[PDB]
Amino acid sequence: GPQDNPYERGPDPTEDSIEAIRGPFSVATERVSSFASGFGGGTIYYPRETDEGTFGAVAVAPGFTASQGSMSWYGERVASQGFIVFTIDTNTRLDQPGQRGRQLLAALDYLVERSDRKVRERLDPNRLAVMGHAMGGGGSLEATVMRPSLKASIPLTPWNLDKTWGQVQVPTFIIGAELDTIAPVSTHAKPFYESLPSSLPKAYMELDGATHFAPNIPNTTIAKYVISWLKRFVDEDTRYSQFLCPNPTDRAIEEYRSTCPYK
Ligand code: 9J6
Ligand SMILES: [Ca+2]
Numbered sequence: 507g508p509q510d511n512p513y514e515r516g517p518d519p520t521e522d523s524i525e526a527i528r529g530p531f532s533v534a535t536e537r538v539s540s541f542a543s544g545f546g547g548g549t550i551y552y553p554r555e556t557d558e559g560t561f562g563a564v565a566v567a568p569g570f571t572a573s574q575g576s577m578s579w580y581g582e583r584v585a586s587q588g589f590i591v592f593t594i595d596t597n598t599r600l601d602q603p604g605q606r607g608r609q610l611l612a613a614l615d616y617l618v619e620r621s622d623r624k625v626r627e628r629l630d631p632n633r634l635a636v637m638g639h640a641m642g643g644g645g646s647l648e649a650t651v652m653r654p655s656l657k658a659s660i661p662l663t664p665w666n667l668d669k670t671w672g673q674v675q676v677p678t679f680i681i682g683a684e685l686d687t688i689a690p691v692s693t694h695a696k697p698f699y700e701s702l703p704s705s706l707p708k709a710y711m712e713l714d715g716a717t718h719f720a721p722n723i724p725n726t727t728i729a730k731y732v733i734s735w736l737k738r739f740v741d742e743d744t745r746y747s748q749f750l751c752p753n754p755t756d757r758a759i760e761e762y763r764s765t766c767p768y769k
């Protein structure tokens with residue numbers, strides 16, 4: 507209930523609600539020009555209804571050679587659960603993970619400092635998160651080292667040649683694709699996960715049979731746990747702990763690792 511947490515948004519969740527293509531909030535968009543400073547522009551998805559209060563935000567980066575269109579399905583699927591979701595483009599499609607991390611932070615700065623009134627009035631600037639695919643997932647990790655005040659980080663089939671993330675202090679949920687040949691889980695996702703502190707709230711979800719591009723098309727297993735992670739950590743919403751702990755056992759999941767419970 508709202509009395510025990512001012513950040514709770516939407517009705518009490520069910521497996522149905524977290525798997526839904528659209529959550530309880532209707533969503534509008536604002537397009538941001540690529541000539542915005544610090545990143546390549548993007549699309550801001552935001553909840554229209556303001557009667558429950560302001561929302562946290564997640565900036566969402568694509569991978570190498572890719573654009574925001576590869577991540578577009580996250581926009582309304584996650585925003586309709588009560589989040590501002592900014593699917594960005596990078597300065598160039600060839601940008602590397604550190605560059606992508608800086609651009610994720612620039613996108614969040616844009617929301618806080620430069621966005622239209624419609625967005626700015628709906629945003630709690632104290633509750634921000636990052637998510638990204640592949641090199642953008644590497645970027646999500648990088649952004650958390652740069653800005654430890656982030657509330658959550660979701661590296662999706664992440665790629666990074668930097669394998670060590672022990673200094674990360676932000677709750678991090680890594681999603682791996684079992685059969686990824688571009689960022690193989692053996693040398694990317696798994697070592698990133700194991701390198702994160704064992705006292706950090708964290709999880710690793712590996713998708714059975716999945717390729718590197720699994721995160722680029724609607725995937726209910728990805729969506730329901732992305733939503734739950736952001737709820738738990740951006741909103742401190744413990745109504746969603748039930749889906750994260752104990753570890754999920756969905757058939758689509760090859761394996762799940764976590765530091766449950768998240769005190
Ligand atoms: C061709 C130059 O480098 C790569 O393909 C590195 C891995 C890119 C992973 C991705 O963001 O999909
Ligand atoms: Ca720009």
Ligand SMILES: [Zn+2]
Nearest residue numbers: 507508510511
């Ligand atoms: Zn409550």
Ligand SMILES: [Zn+2]
Nearest residue numbers: 668669670671
């Ligand atoms: Zn490192």
Ligand SMILES: [Zn+2]
Nearest residue numbers: 684714715760
């Ligand atoms: Zn498998």
